Structures are given as structure tokens and as C-alpha cells.
């Protein structure tokens, strides 16, 4: 009975440019314990993506300032540690929610591939800053989560589909940035591009319009990786 109220509050917080409140409402609406639809699932994805992206951009700028040179160095180290703490908190929050309430109850291959992709994504965000054994563990979790979603996508999910294309894009960028193995990233992006072009003709107008954006990002990343 409260689900519509929480989703309305989430939409209002999105419109008001305050992503934290919409993220909290999203958290409650999933913690209630019923199956989620595409609209609320995308609202969760965009809310958590926005907050984590703001934290990540702040961390990137902090690290860039820290790189240059005396107490500034340890001050920037402490600031980076604080931003790391916030990033780890939000990432572990979303992963814990995903393991406990979402993927287990997911019923449609489409839902399963989306939640597995989100899990692999946030493990990638953790790996982007994590070092050492924790980095190794989160890398393993990211690869496993991405691979399972890849399997279900190849098994059932439509090959022109925007979620399949986005999974290919994220898997490739993970391969390139984290695993430091650009060959696999280039191969995966090339095969995804080729399959999408193979089934490009039968696309509708709207499906063409959303798919082409991920296609263009795949092309740009392929060009960046291929170039010197």
C-alpha cells in the first residue's frame, strides 16, 4: 500500500536533484519484499549510479591533486581515505541489498541479467580504488557476476537488446581498465558490435534509438583502445 508512496517520493527526489533521498526510498521499496518492475528498477539504478558517480568523480579529482607535491600530501591522503570510506559504504550497501533481496527473488532472465550486471558494476567500482587482497577478491566477484549475466544473455536474451549491449560495454571496460588485458576487451566489444550489426536491420525506431547510443560508446571505446 506504501509502494506507490515510496516510488512517488523517489520520483520527486529525482526531480529535485537530491539523489540521496531517492536512493533511500528505493532501498525501502525493495526491502519491503515484492517483485520490482522496470520503472522502479531503473529508478534504483539511476539513483545509486548518480550518488556513486558523484563520489567517484570527487575521488578522482582528490587523487589527481594528491599526485602533485609538504603537509599537503598527507592532507590529501586523509581526504582520499575519507572519500574511499564513503565510496566503500555505498558500494557495500548496494551489493548487500542485491545479494539479499533482489537477485535471489528475480524471476525473469531479463531481471537476472540486469541485477547480475549491476552487481558486477559495483564490484568494479570497488575494485577501481581497492588495493591488494581486497582488490583481488572484488575483481574475482566482478568477473564471476559479469560472466553469469553473459551466460544468461547468450542463452535467452535478445541480441539487439540494450541491456545486452550495455553488459558488453561494461564487461569490455572492466576488462580494459581493471584486468589490464585490452585484448579480451577489444575482442568482446568487436563480437558484440558484430552481432548487433547482424541483427540491426529488424530494429524498430525506438529500439534503434536507444541501442545506437551504447553502440556509439562501444565504437568510441574500441577506437580509444585500438589507437596508440
Amino acid at each position: 500500500v506504501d509502494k506507490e508512496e515510496l516510488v512517488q517520493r523517489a520520483k520527486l527526489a529525482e526531480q529535485a536533484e537530491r539523489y540521496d533521498d531517492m536512493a533511500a526510498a528505493m532501498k525501502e521499496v525493495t526491502e519491503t519484499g515484492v517483485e520490482l518492475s522496470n520503472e522502479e528498477r531503473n529508478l534504483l539504478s539511476v539513483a545509486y549510479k548518480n550518488v556513486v558517480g558523484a563520489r567517484r568523480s570527487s575521488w578522482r579529482v582528490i587523487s589527481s591533486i594528491e599526485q602533485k607535491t609538504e603537509r599537503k600530501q598527507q592532507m590529501a591522503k586523509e581526504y582520499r581515505v575519507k572519500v574511499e570510506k564513503e565510496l566503500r559504504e555505498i558500494c557495500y550497501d548496494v551489493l548487500g541489498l542485491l545479494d539479499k533481496h533482489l537477485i535471489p527473488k528475480a524471476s525473469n532472465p531479463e531481471s537476472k541479467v540486469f541485477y547480475l550486471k549491476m552487481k558486477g558494476d559495483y564490484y568494479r567500482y570497488l575494485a577501481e580504488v581497492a588495493t591488494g587482497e581486497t582488490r583481488n577478491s572484488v575483481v574475482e566477484d566482478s568477473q564471476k557476476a559479469y560472466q553469469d549475466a553473459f551466460e544468461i544473455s547468450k542463452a535467452k536474451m535478445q541480441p539487439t537488446h540494450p541491456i545486452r549491449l550495455g553488459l558488453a560495454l561494461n564487461f569490455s571496460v572492466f576488462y580494459y581498465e581493471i584486468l589490464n588485458s585490452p585484448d579480451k576487451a577489444c575482442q568482446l566489444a568487436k563480437q558484440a558490435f558484430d552481432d548487433a550489426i547482424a541483427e540491426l536491420d529488424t530494429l524498430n525506431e525506438d529500439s534503434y534509438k536507444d541501442s545506437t547510443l551504447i553502440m556509439q560508446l562501444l565504437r568510441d571505446n574500441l577506437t580509444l583502445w585500438t589507437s596508440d
Binding site: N42, D121, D220, N221
Partner: protein, 269 residues
């Protein structure tokens, strides 16, 4: 023809000789600045008129007409944008690499049209290349243009030589474009480490020295350095012509990447 009655023109400000004003729209009027036009001056102005009457390109400053009544002036299009000399070092705009090739390709395309119509712009610098509006490039004045001193940085050693001061071929315009290229690419100016124009033009005019090419950027592909090297050469017997230079720049623009960091999936909805 293109003769425009002197009564129907307005001259707002003296911000150029060149007079900002309006003529069915904001235009630029280049008054002669001398009351009496000696026969040689009149000959030069009809050469200017003839050379401008044959250029109609989207990368060339548009010619609107000439007024010959009580003074000689050529009405040209008015562009709202810097002359790219400011953007070079004075304004320090710091374009990105992907926007740093489009200017070169557009300048090469304008020079292609000029050379195809048998028009030699002769000497040109970074100032004559107008970066009007959204990065579009317009070729400027045609004062030295003929159909067949303050700054010597952008002008060819053969062109200083002028043993007979008769010859002016297309290879002069090549280096003119090639030197504009590195200037655009590197964002800096060679021979600026010192302040002796006579010495630098003596060493570059007679082949003693060459512009340094190592000031160029790290993001650069190897092909761009090769193109700039093939542009800035001492000997211009077969300096590569503008059609093939435009082909090379188009290929290299095609092969270039347009982002600095790998981009994942954008925010949904």
C-alpha cells in the same frame, strides 16, 4: 554588377581601412584610406576585386560588393569570432585534440578550393584564418592574392629569397598551411625563444636552421608528425600538394579517437 551605391551604406566604427558597419546586415567595409588612388593603387584594387569575385566557398570570407564612389572599398562578410591568433597564445583557449584536427581539415579544404580556382592566397598567417562561430574556419584577406614584414614566422624561405621576386607557386601556400598546422597543433610559436627577427629570418631563409618539431603534443599520432614534417621542408620542388594533403588529413581524422577516458554505460533514464 557588384558595384554598390555609396549612399546606401553605414560605417559604425573604425576597428580595422576596415570599417565595421551595416549594409542590409552587419558587414565589413575596407575603405582604401587614401583619398587619391594612383593608377597602381587602382590596378591593385581591381586585382583584389577580380580575385575576390571568383571565390565562393563556405571556408572563405564572403565577398559582398565593392564601392568606388569617392573612395575604394570592398564589402565583405562580418564574422563574430576571434582571428585564431588570439586563440593561439593570446587568448589561450586550449582546444582538445579532436577539435584540433577539424580546424586543419577545414583550412585545407578552403585552400583546396582556392587552388582549384587558380587562386594563390600568397602569404598567410594564423591571423587571417578566422575561427568564426562554432569552430568553422574562414580564410581572411586577399590583399596579396593574385591569379597566375613584421612577422616572418609563417612565411617560406623561398618566398624571402625572391631573387627575381617574380615566382609564386602552390608550394608556398603548402608551407603556409603546414606552418599554420603545427602552430595550431602545438599551441605555441617557434623562434619565440629569442627576439632577433633579422637573425631568425637569416637562419631560416638560407637553410641554416629549421623550425623545431619536438614541441608537439604527446597525444599526437605518429602520422600527424609525418604530415607536419612533409609540410615543413627546406626544399619545395615536389612539396605535396593540397588535394593529397587534404586526403591525408581526412584519413588521419578518421583514424583518431575522440575521448580521453573509456566511457561505460550512461545513466539510465
Amino acid at each position: 554588377d557588384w558595384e554598390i551605391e555609396a549612399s546606401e551604406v553605414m560605417l559604425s566604427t573604425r576597428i580595422g581601412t576596415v570599417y565595421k558597419g551595416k549594409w542590409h546586415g552587419d558587414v565589413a567595409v575596407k575603405i582604401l584610406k587614401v583619398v587619391d588612388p594612383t593608377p597602381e593603387q587602382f590596378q591593385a584594387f581591381r586585382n583584389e576585386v577580380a580575385v575576390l569575385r571568383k571565390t565562393r566557398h563556405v571556408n572563405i570570407l564572403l565577398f559582398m560588393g565593392y564601392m568606388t564612389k569617392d573612395n575604394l572599398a570592398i564589402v565583405t562578410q562580418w564574422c563574430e569570432g576571434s582571428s585564431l591568433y588570439k586563440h593561439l597564445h593570446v587568448q589561450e583557449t586550449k582546444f582538445q585534440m579532436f577539435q584540433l584536427i577539424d580546424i586543419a581539415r577545414q583550412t585545407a579544404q578552403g585552400m583546396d578550393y582556392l587552388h582549384a580556382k587558380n587562386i594563390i592566397h600568397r602569404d598567410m598567417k594564423s591571423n587571417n584564418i578566422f575561427l568564426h562561430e562554432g569552430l568553422t574556419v574562414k580564410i581572411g584577406d586577399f590583399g596579396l592574392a593574385t591569379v597566375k614584414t613584421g612577422s616572418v614566422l609563417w612565411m617560406a624561405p623561398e618566398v624571402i629569397r625572391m631573387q627575381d621576386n617574380n615566382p609564386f607557386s602552390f608550394q608556398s601556400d603548402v608551407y603556409s598551411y603546414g606552418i599554420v598546422l603545427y602552430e595550431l597543433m602545438t599551441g605555441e610559436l617557434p623562434y619565440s625563444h629569442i627576439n632577433n627577427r633579422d637573425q631568425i629570418i637569416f637562419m631560416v631563409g638560407r637553410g641554416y636552421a629549421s623550425p623545431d618539431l619536438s614541441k608537439l603534443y604527446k597525444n599526437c599520432p605518429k602520422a600527424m608528425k609525418r604530415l607536419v614534417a612533409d609540410c615543413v621542408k627546406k626544399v619545395k620542388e615536389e612539396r605535396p600538394l593540397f588535394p593529397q594533403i587534404l586526403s591525408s588529413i581526412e584519413l588521419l581524422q578518421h583514424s583518431l579517437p575522440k575521448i580521453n577516458r573509456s566511457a561505460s554505460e550512461p545513466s539510465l533514464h
